[PDB]
Amino acid sequence: LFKLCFMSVSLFPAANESVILPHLNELILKSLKLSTTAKEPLVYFYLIRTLFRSIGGGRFENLYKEIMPLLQVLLESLSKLIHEARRPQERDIYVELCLTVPVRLSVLVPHLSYLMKPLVYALNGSQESVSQGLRTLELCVDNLTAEYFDPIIEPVIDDVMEALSKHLKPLPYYHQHSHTTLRILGKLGGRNRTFIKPVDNLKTDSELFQNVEAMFKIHGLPNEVPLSITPGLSAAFSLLTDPRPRIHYRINSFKYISGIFQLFLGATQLPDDYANRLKEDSQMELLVKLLESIFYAVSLQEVREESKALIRGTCNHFILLYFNKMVINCIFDAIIYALSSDNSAVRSMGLESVQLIYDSCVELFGNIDCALKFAPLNVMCSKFIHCCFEEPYHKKLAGCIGLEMMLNSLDIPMKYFNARQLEIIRALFYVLRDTAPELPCEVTNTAKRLILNSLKEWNKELTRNDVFSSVFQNLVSSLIVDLPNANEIVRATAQEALRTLSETTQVPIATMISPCKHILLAPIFGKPLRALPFQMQIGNIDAITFCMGLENSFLEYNEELNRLVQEALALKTSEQLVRLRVVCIQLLSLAITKPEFAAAQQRSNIRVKILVVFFKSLCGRSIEIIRAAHGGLKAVIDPKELLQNGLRPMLMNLSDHKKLTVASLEALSGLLKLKVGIGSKLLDHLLAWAQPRTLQQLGSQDLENNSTVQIIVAILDVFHLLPPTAHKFMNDLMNALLYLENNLHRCQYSPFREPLAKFLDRFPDESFEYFFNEFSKREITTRFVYFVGLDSCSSLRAKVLESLPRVRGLLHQEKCVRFSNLVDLCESLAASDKEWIKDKEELLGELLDAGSVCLTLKRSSNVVSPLYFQVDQGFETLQLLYIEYFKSQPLGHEKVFNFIDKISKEGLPFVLEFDDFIFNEVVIPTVQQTLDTIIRMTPQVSSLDARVYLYKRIFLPICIYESEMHGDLSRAWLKSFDSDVWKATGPLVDDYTSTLEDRYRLELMQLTALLI
Amino acid sequence: PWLNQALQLLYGSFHLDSPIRLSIIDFVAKHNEFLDSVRSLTAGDILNPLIDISYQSAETIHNAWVVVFPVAYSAIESRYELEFTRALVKLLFKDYHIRQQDARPNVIKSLLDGVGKCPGLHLPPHLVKYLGSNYNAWYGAIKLLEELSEGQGIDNQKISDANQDALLEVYMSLQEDDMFYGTWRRRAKYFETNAALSYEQIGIWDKALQLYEAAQIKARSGVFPFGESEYSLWEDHWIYCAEKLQHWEILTELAKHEGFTDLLLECGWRWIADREPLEQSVKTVMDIPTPRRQIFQTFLALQGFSQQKDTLQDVSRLCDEGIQLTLRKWNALPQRVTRAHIGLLHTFQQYVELMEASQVYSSLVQELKRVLQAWRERLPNVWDDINIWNDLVTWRQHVFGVINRVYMAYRGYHEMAWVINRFAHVARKHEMPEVCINQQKAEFFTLKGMFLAKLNAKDEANQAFATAVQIPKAWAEWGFFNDRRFKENPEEIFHAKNAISCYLQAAGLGKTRKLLCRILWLISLDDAAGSLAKTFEDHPVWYWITFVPQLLTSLSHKEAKIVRHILIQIAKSYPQSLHFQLRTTKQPWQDVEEIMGILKTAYPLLALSLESLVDQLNQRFGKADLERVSLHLSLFHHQKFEDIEIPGQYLLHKDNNNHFIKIERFLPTLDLVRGSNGCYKRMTIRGNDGSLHPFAVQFPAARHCRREERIFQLFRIFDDALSRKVQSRRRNISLTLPIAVPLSPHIRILNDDKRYTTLMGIYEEFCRRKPSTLLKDYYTEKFSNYENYWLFRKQFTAQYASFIFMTYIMCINSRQPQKIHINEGSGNIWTSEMLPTFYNTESVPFRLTPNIQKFIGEAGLEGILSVYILVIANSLSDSEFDMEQYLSLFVRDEVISWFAQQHRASAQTNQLREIVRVNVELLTKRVLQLNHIPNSQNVATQFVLNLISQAVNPRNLAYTDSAWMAYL
Amino acid sequence: TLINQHILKPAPPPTEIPARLQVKPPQPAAMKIPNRPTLLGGSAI
């Protein structure tokens, strides 16, 4: 659907441009913000790719100068840390967003630098996005200057000319790329060979190059000659991990890889008497690459029964070495890729192998205490600890997944996990620090919950205030010096942990950080401000607005920066600038609202300044800077000359100018939360916009995307918070609504139908006393039955339910007999709760009587078309709610009462609602009961015999379903059926005259032919 | 590749046998069943998947042929190798048309690289040259043509001379000339051609051609037999130098007589009127096409379109089918881009300006100006070649020519005058001021001012420099005459006060280091008056920051008021350039607290974040973790203020301070490596670009550390002047000494990483595995894939001559093998602890012990190591007084340390001008004397051959020290 | 700025295999210095 929508603006350089244009600023930023917190984050990057492709050579793209330095540093920071999820080259989607940003190269492209390292990923390993990579390289050679462009590419000039030289090849290769590359290497003339230098990356016999020598036996050479059994190891690794080749090569690549691996394993000399012993450099990076492809072979079908068979072998093998080296490690570096992999099968085999290094270790020694003194269980602790301090993102995921199982399988000696308490948590704060905010949050969600659940786990034992000497307080002194800093996920969890640390071992939180609270303050007071740029200046406030949320802390001398604050308030980087002033509110709002400190300061004119600046910020140029400022004024309510000074700038913005923006309107709505003449003033404000020559020009434009409508609805929002007098603004405000819909030609919906309703929530009595008087009119009462059906009028539905039967009296007392209005009213509040319908019955027949009165006048050919669609859709609405009553009771004799009451109209009742409701009474000793009631009600021959016939759809489908799902009539009525119809007399059916009565007599003949 | 089916025929002979090997009571019995009875691998399931792998990748078949065919040949017994060789030679002659693979690791490449792995067969050398050049595997052919030449002798002169000719046109094809000119003079027999070959790889082509015409008259009824080859050198390198010298009318009449492409080349470019003789003579030679001959075919199709004789579309087709032939010659070359490719990178610029001039004079019968300026900038380097500079001027002249002919407010081109003047300037920049001469008022006065300055005309040059200053370089040249006057007059000359204020008038008006080295010495010339300090306040801030360790010493001495004025300039502007250097000195020491206080008031955050890096390095200081002992540094880059540059960037040049790499994060590995001094703690800093920078803090720093920073500083002055010239930048001879920034009086860091294993570390590596030929044994088992081995050796010997020059000049004492660091992936060689003293103490002239002299190769010892030591001296003697100008202020801090060395006091203050003037006179007479003798009778070098003959003499080698390790 | 040309179409020109050989060990070995401009494609044996 995004493909269908974004290709439309490529079809129209027209009025189909300004409707998409403001939304794509949100649709990009909310796709970056959702990709870090999604289950499959790649569809949020497929979305922007069809946005960037669907435009090109466009109109201006003037709204991309602001999102570009945050979109590049998102893409370059996860083109590094991404290594092919399923196997899709998902690093080759990030480069195609990075290289095809749809802007001009002149001023926007400068600062592209970010584009030099994804330039070489597009040229080297790609197939037809090479042509995208050469196209941007041709643009930046001839346009730019050599004094500017040459210092940019110096880190990757030696790497782009190796990938440019793989494209110069003759006519079997492309004539497209090989001729484009020659033009790039010619259009810069002497700067070709200015990089040609002595080489440095001479491959000095690397790990897969390692000539391992297996001793063979050949027939000519009569000895044991050694040969290198690794000439295909480079092609074994690249065949096993590609889905493109056939499966037979991929299975043979494993038999090669496991074939070399079993020659390293079994060549080790085993012990002569290991049971008696129990009573008493370049290989080790080759084996990790070998054992990793064994772990990847678990994810392959039809061979995982064999690859698992030696994975359990080698993990058993590598623990008896260390238990024989007690008189005197490639599995751990191979486990951490299995833990950090992508497929669930290889990940679970990482989880099965960490158990087997313990489940066999308890089988060998037995005593778990001596199996932690020198055992390999102790060293896989510090492997999981250390690899949280790694550079790449995926190795942080291994130490966070490996640790959370290493605390749910070693559960028994938790005394071991108290000496390593601080070293785990310091390792688990660090993973919150050097993780980018644009990476997916699976490494931080398992790190946030692991500090929280562990301190509830191994700190449920500490006694009292006396034992707080050195060991526990150093833990507290670690997570309070990490309170003031940026990257708020390490700042929010330093408060969530310290709360639950002091929840158990019940100690006041102020007394817990008490002997080290002066060590925290001293950096935060020393340098006051104007250093420590705006990322840090949110962190300096955050440690103090938490500290005054304690029971008591630092009752003196925060006023050295309390001036400093007011003035930072009194004056992307624009994102953090409004993030800066939104936290100085919370520091100032907690300065006055807390008692026993406002009386302490009150001798040198402090609170006044705070209040005054809190104002001047009320007319700010943003929206969310007003909302927290609104929370500060609503907290200090529990002066008047300053209120008149504040109302002076408020009434100046409230002047009759017809130019009031929506920022001042919500600030006005925030002001009335804390005279009535503005209602006379604001009606004439909207009527300047509400002339019909401002709405007929609108005509058919969409209302939600429009901007002049948002000024209209924000005006209507203020009427929720009026003065509480008995308002005479009921009639003219709703007359302003009906006038606003007819000139828009828009019925049944509008965006300004919602704020009209919250006004009606305020006045339930004055609303219904307006509606009940003008009830026979159609066009205003249609808005009523939407307002009752709204969930926001919870106080209006309580009025109309209590005052229900006074509108029933209207139907007793001639073209304005509005049966049709009452039906939609009762339908609207029956959809509110399914419990209202169960007691009303004299209502429901009184609707159908006066409806059947209206179907006498409406069945008259005197005028041409009196079939008004309000009346006939009254019946199709009445009937589907008359069935909503029926499936609340279990009685099978009420459905045969709806029949005779509709004899003047429509014959068989309405389809799609009742023919599948009889089919749920047909489809038990109550099926015998319905056939008693039919033979009771049918000899009422005055019931208009098309209803008497109508039991052909309700009598016989019972029996022909009984005689199909059961054997033959295995299951009262027969004693009563034979009583009347087979002792029948002359006037009824036992006469003989060819009329329409014979259509009923076939219900009698076709039933007896089924009883026999 | 049919080697896949040749493998399975060879794999069938493998006896696929069951042993393959390399060479609580219930649990132990369970595994012991597994690890030996289920391990038990037969030879089948190794080789059977190897078949199924090799059907996919063409590199496995090349990788498996080279390991099984020498096993196969070793069972071909005696009396059948000659039967095998002739049956193999017959296979390589079996053309399958072109034996048309011509693709990646094909049959010929994998067959020729499998021959060299087995000794005993010796394929004919002109077939190896043909198979290696035509298909691929050039370096698979030099493995065979050097194995036959060196090592044993083949016991036949006619197989040994046909090998050398087959070798010398492999080196010519790959355009390494230093191995070409060193294999020839190892071979050639006359004296007149061993002189002319060596005057020609230096590059003076006037004494090269004289020694060729005086070589042939040694023949022609001379008694000497002169050989068949060495006569293809005389008659072809007479005409090589005669077209380097640009004598194009003499070799016109020469090529009139024989008649070939040389007539088409010189008479052609040096076409609208003589098109008909030129066009038909092209088509006689246009068959068997080459990338050169299509440029003649295209250009006359372009100047036929100019006269309307030829249609446009044809030039597009002629440029299209000609580029696809240029593509095929690029694909026949090796993978790594070397000097063998530069001939094709100039063909590329011909084709771009041939499809560009096909639209400049298509729309001819304000776009022209854009094309003109793009063209005025698309020029090769100043060091490139004097031929391929000339092959660009010719083209451009032709083109602008047509535009001028057709344009018949200023319509005048005057652009042919630009490409001539640009070529006339680079013709003097190379060598030989004769090729340039045959083709705005103060400069005429500066020429007459310099003409009076050569003779003894003081008032005439002063009036001319005043005439030039009244109308740039003369503002410093007049004081340079006064600097020449002050050295000529007595010690009370006052013109130096009129000189140091003169060079600062245009010091703000690049090469500012050549005057700042002259400024910072005459201020210390016993200024008891100090009148130049007022002259310093009469009226260049970056270019002092290289001279910082000289500046911070002069604060304790005199002129302390003015040298304070130039460090308050730097620290206000560049804080990172000075904070580490002033912290190493901690009013003999009291004035720098005002400099420190200036460093802290301005930039309050940078001085705070930097000291938090120093003290964490100061407190604590196979693999260890940074997490345990230095956890403040893992938390550094979260609280890291704004930016911190990686240290050791202000020592070098790059004078604009924009693209210096800043610290991103510290990698958590402390890769301590048992070094030769003991062990140190190598950290690793990750840069902005992903480039990791491994440093190495060392715990002590002995009292030479404030002297060896001044030694490396001197070759920060030579190394950029080494890269500016032509015969030194053509060969890329970077002096490669490392950065070493000090952080404290005790702790200094310096840049070193893995693969810097020193020469003694090679020696204990061999005895751990337990003569001569120990570098030749260690570097062949380490470097398989001979393309890597040949390039590493060639870069080793080219860097060893840069080790010899800095050891000979400014004489370093006994270089033990543990004092000389060799790279293992690049070959860059540098020395630690350079302490010069500057007289002959007890020495052989340099270290050339025969465990190196075998690895050099005895044909790069003549062609690289003997001429790179010359071409370093041939530029440093004559750039701008590198042996005189800079060397004053770098000995006046040596002789004040020598007086503190030999005793405690110091004397000879008035004589201190003469102790500097003597020990600079040795260092200007140690560089200059080993340059080439200007007569034509010497070979070309003859003094660096005099010193190499001394350093390899086994008398002069063992007579010296015994801990010097003169056997390895 | 500059406005650039474009590649036309897949047009196939194949080369051919000439017949001679050469031995001569000097740098020019033909009419001039560089060799990959003055060497005949791929030669026949």
Chain A stretch 420-439, residues whose beta carbon is closer than 8 A to a beta carbon of chain B: 426-427, 430, 433-434
How many CB pairs below 8 Å do chains B and C form together? 122
Q: Is B829 in a helix, a strand, or coil?
A: strand
**CB pairs A-B closer than 8 Å:** 258
Contact criterion met (CB below 8 Å) for A930 and A918: no
User: Whose CA is closest to A77, among A30, A114, A26, A116?
Assistant: A114
Q: What DSSP state is assigned to residue B577?
A: T
The answer to whether the CB atoms of C7 and A143 lie below 8 A apart is no
Q: What is the SS3 assignment for A345?
A: helix
A143–chain C Cβ distance below 8 A for any pair: yes
Strand B740-742 and strand B695-698: the pairing is unpaired
- Looking at residue B586, what DSSP letter applies? -
Instruction: Report whether A108 contacts A89 (CB < 8 A).
Output: no
Query: What one-character-per-residue DSSP string does C24-37 give?
Result: --SS-SSSSS-STT
Kindly determine whether residue A252 and residue B783, on different chains, have CB atoms separated by under 8 Å. Answer: no
Contact B35 A317 (CB under 8 A): yes
In chain B, what residues touch A161 (CB-CB under 8 Å)?
337
Is A178 in the B-facing interface, judged by CB distances under 8 Å? yes
Tokens of B175: 């355009």
DSSP assignment of B203-266: T--HHHHHHHHHHHTTSSS-S----STTSTTHHHHHHHHHHHTT-TTHHHHHHHHS-SHHHHHH
Q: Is B680 helix (H, G, I), strand (E, B) or coil?
A: strand
**Closest CA–CA distance from residue A229 to any residue of chain C (Å):** 36
Report the sign of the C-alpha dihedral through residues A607, A608, A611, A617, in that order: negative
Q: Chain A residue with minimal CA distance to B356?
A: A187
Token pair in block for residue A214: 């297996």
Cα distance between the two ends of chain A? 62
Whole-number Å distance between alpha carbons of B490 and B496: 12
Q: How far apart are the CA of A171 and the nearest CA of chain C, in angstroms? A: 7
In this structure, are residues A235 and A252 in contact, taking their beta carbons and an 8 Å threshold? Answer: no
Pairwise CB contact (< 8 Å): C7 & A176: yes
Closest CA to A429 of A381, A374, A389, A371: A389
Closest residue of chain C to B200, computed from CA coordinates: C27
Which residues in chain B have their CB less than 8 angstroms from residue C28's CB?
Answer: 236-237, 239-240
- CA distance to partner chain B, nearest, from residue C9 (Å): 11
CB contacts, 8 Å: A220 with chain B: 13, 72, 75
CA distances from B807 to A890, B732, B838, B871 (A): 111, 19, 11, 16
Cβ atoms of A980 and A933 within 8 Å: the answer is no
Structure tokens of B575? Answer: 């804080």
- Residues closing a segment before a gap in chain A (C–N exceeding 2.5 Å): 280, 328, 571, 638, 674, 813, 923, 971
Residue with tokens 């061979």: A303
Taking Cα atoms as reference points, which of B257, B319, B258 lies closest to residue B294?
B319
Q: How far apart are CA A737 and CA A783, in angstroms?
A: 9
Contact B134 C43 (CB under 8 A): yes
Q: For residue A179, give the chain C residue with the closest CA.
A: C7
Where would I find the H helices in A548-604?
559-570, 573-592, 598-601
Which token pair is A346? 């290889």
Helix axes of A778-789 and A755-762: crossing angle, nearest 10 degrees: 80
Q: Please, which chains are in contact with B (at least 3 CB pairs closer than 8 A)? A: A, C
Tokens coding A661: 């923006």
The number of C-alpha atoms within 13 Å of B368 and in the hemisphere containing its C-beta is: 15
Do residues A31 and A47 make contact, with C-beta atoms less than 8 angstroms apart? Answer: yes
**Which other chains touch chain A, taking contact as 3+ CB pairs less than 8 Å apart?**
B, C
User: What are A677's two structure tokens?
Assistant: 């003449």
CA distances from B798 to B307, B734, B864 (A): 53, 10, 6
A422 contact partners, CB below 8 Å, separation of at least 6: A474, A475, A478
Contact yes or no for C25 and B172 at CB 8 A: yes
Which residues in chain C are contacts of B262 at CB distance < 8 A? 31-32
Beta-carbon count within 10 A of B947 CB? 19
Would you mind telling me the total number of residues written for chain A in this entry? 1012
Q: What is the signed CA dihedral for A413, A419, A423, A426, rounded to 10 degrees? A: 90
**CB pair distance less than 8 Å for B52 and A249:** yes
- Give the whole-angstrom CA distance, residue A206 versus residue A70: 39
> Which residues are within 8 A (CB) of B733 and not within 5 positions of it... i.e. 6 or more apart?
B722, B798, B799, B801, B802, B868, B871, B872
Q: Is A111 on the interface with B (CB under 8 A)?
A: no
Task: Tell me which residues of chain B, numbers 749 to 788, contact chain A at a CB-CB cutoff of 8 Å.
Answer: 755, 782-785, 788
Among B650, B445, B688, B468, which Cα is nearest to B549's?
B650
> Using CB atoms and an 8 Å cut-off, which of residues 3-32 of chain C contact chain B?
5, 8, 11, 13, 15, 17-18, 20-32
Backbone angles phi, psi at B274, to 5 degrees: -100, 35
Query: Nearest to residue A136, comparing CAs of A160, A169, A170, A162?
Result: A160
Q: How far is residue B193 CA from its own chain's centroid?
A: 27
- Nearest CA-CA partner of B175 in A419, A152, A196: A196
How close, in Å, is residue C34 to chain A by CA atoms? 16
For residue A148, what are the contacts with CB-CB under 8 A and spacing of at least 6? Answer: none
Give CA–CA dist A64/A70, Å, rounded: 11
Which residues of chain C does A180 touch, with a Cβ-Cβ cutoff of 8 Å?
A: 7
Q: Which A residues in the span 122-141 are in contact with C, Cβ-Cβ below 8 Å? A: 138
For residues B864 and B794, the answer to whether their CB atoms sit within 8 Å is yes
**CA-CA distance, B624 to B668, in Å (whole number)?**
8
Residues 6+ apart with CB under 8 A from A692: A743
> Which of C1, C7, C12 has the CB atom closest to A179's CB atom?
C7
Q: Which residues of B touch C15 (CB under 8 A)?
A: 289, 325, 328
- Give SS3 for A891: coil
Counting every residue, how long is chain B? 968
Nearest CA distance, A9 vs chain C (angstrom): 28
* Interface contact B15-A218, CB threshold 8 A: yes
Sign of the CA dihedral B118, B119, B123, B127?
positive
Residues of B in contact with A213 (CB under 8 A): 22-23
Residue with tokens 């293809």: B232
Q: In the numeric block, which tokens belong to residue A847?
A: 């609707």
Q: Which helix (H) or strand (E) element contains residue B679?
A: strand B679-680
Q: What CA–CA distance (Å, rounded) separates A443 from B905?
A: 67
Residue B313: partners with Cβ closer than 8 Å, 6 or more residues away: none
Q: Do A219 and B13 touch (CB under 8 A)?
A: yes
- Inspect the interface and report whether the beta carbons of B289 and C41 lie closer than 8 Å: yes
CA angle B696–B698–B702, rounded 5-degree value: 140
| Amino acid code (one letter) for A580 | L
d(CA A192, CA A190): 5
